[PDB]
Amino acid sequence: VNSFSGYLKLTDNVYIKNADIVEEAKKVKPTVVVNAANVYLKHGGGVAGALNKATNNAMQVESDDYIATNGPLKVGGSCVLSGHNLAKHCLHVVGPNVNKGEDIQLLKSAYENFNQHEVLLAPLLSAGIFGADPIHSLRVCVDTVRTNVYLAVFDKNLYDKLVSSFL
Ligand SMILES: NC(=O)c1c[nH]c2ncnc(NCc3cc(O)ccc3F)c12
């Protein structure tokens, strides 16, 4: 039993909800919140911009130190950093950004990072400003992630479409 509330169950391990991931994280304080990161951990917009703003820019300060030490992530890769006031940990996961021409096949590799954590609050990878089809992202999620994932979908119109079209 966990503290997530109001999710629709899609499969044995995948759950979905119309919610603002920032507000959901503040309420649940999950062990792991997933950020829709880019390889530079520059949290300018989308989910990343919103998660960072909620931390009063502490996420960005920590991220800049991480990059200065370790260099950029790989597309499809991830790193674990602090969750600040939102969660115990933040798993920064880089899905391909279609508006940069990156291979959509890397979306599966990106979701594989979730399997290193028993329970996660997450957005759909590569959705929103990363330019991928959220219906496809949900399909890859369900077919790749085996751990317990709670998906927060910001747009109410999009959520109903994902549910209604889910096979
Ligand atoms: N600034 C942001 O994007 C977000 C900030 N918090 C969030 N919490 C959950 N979902 C989000 N985006 C999902 C989304 C995907 C899509 O394809 C179209 C619209 C849309 F809203 C965001």
UniProtKB/Swiss-Prot annotation:
- Tell me which domain of life the UniProt entry assigns to the organism this sequence originates from: Viruses
- Please summarize the record's notes on activators and inhibitors of this protein: Inhibited in vitro by GRL-0617.
Show where the Macro domain sits. Answer: 1-167
- Membrane topology type: Multi-pass membrane protein
Q: Where in the cell is it found?
A: Host endoplasmic reticulum membrane
| Catalyzed reaction equations | Thiol-dependent hydrolysis of ester, thioester, amide, peptide and isopeptide bonds formed by the C-terminal Gly of ubiquitin (a 76-residue protein attached to proteins as an intracellular targeting signal)
Protein's job: Responsible for the cleavages located at the N-terminus of the replicase polyprotein. Participates together with nsp4 in the assembly of virally-induced cytoplasmic double-membrane vesicles necessary for viral replication. Antagonizes innate immune induction of type I interferon by blocking the phosphorylation, dimerization and subsequent nuclear translocation of host IRF3. Also prevents host NF-kappa-B signaling. In addition, PL-PRO possesses a deubiquitinating/deISGylating activity and processes both 'Lys-48'- and 'Lys-63'-linked polyubiquitin chains from cellular substrates.
Assembly notes:
May form homohexamers. Interacts with N protein.
**Protein name stated in the entry:** Papain-like protease nsp3
Gene that this sequence comes from: rep
Question: Which portion of the complete protein is shown here?
Answer: 1025 to 1191 of 7096
